[PDB]
């Protein structure tokens, strides 16, 4: 909506912000992944000191839950990638809408000689 110049500024802002958002999400997620590795290493430090059978069975189920959490993060990353692709497609659609609006054959105006 609005003038074609506003459409142009909105589209350029969306493109730049989308690229920056992709980068920032990747960076923060990688930091989280490194902390996840530290946590896994900690769980294996506990495995060395386990004494009874109940303790090691609880630790096995804890590590299984940890694996489930990493699985969930994998699914979330897949979902983020799909959303990234959808956002790029939407930006392209907006570009083409602006292009169609400029070149539409339904336009009736032209400069006036005065």
Among 41, 65, 68, 109, binds another protein (CB under 8 A): 109
Residue 18: CB partners within 8 Å, gap ≥ 6? 84, 87, 88, 91
Burial 78-110, CB ≥16 within 10 A → b, else e:
eeeeeebeebeeebeeebeeeeeeeeeeeeeee
Minimal distance in Å, beta carbon 6 to another protein?
A: 11
Closer to another protein at the Cβ: 50 or 94?
94
Which of positions 83-102 make contact with another protein (CB under 8 A)?
A: 95-96, 99-102
What does the alpha-carbon distance between residue 95 and residue 11 come to, in Å, rounded to a whole number? Answer: 7
Minimal distance in Å, beta carbon 90 to another protein?
A: 15
Residue 71 touching another protein (CB under 8 A): no
Residue 62: CB partners within 8 Å, gap ≥ 6? 43
Minimal distance in Å, beta carbon 85 to another protein?
A: 17
Contact 7, 98 (CB under 8 A): yes
| Stretch in the footprint of another protein (CB under 8 A) among 2-10, 21-29, 57-65, 80-88 | 2-10
- Interface with another protein (CB under 8 A): 3-4, 8, 12, 95-96, 99-105, 107-114
């Amino acid at each position: 909506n609005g003038s074609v110049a506003d459409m142009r500024r909105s589209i350029e802002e969306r493109s730049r912000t989308a690229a920056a958002t992709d980068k920032a999400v990747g960076l923060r997620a990688y930091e989280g992944a490194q902390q996840r590795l530290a946590q896994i290493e900690g769980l294996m430090d506990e495995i060395s000191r386990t004494q009874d059978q109940k303790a090691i069975e609880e630790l096995q189920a804890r590590i299984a839950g940890e694996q489930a959490a990493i699985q969930n993060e994998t699914t979330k990353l897949q979902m983020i990638a799909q959303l990234r692709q959808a956002e790029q497609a939407l930006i392209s659609e907006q570009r083409r809408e602006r292009n169609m609006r400029i070149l539409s054959s339904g336009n009736q105006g032209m400069p006036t000689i005065q």
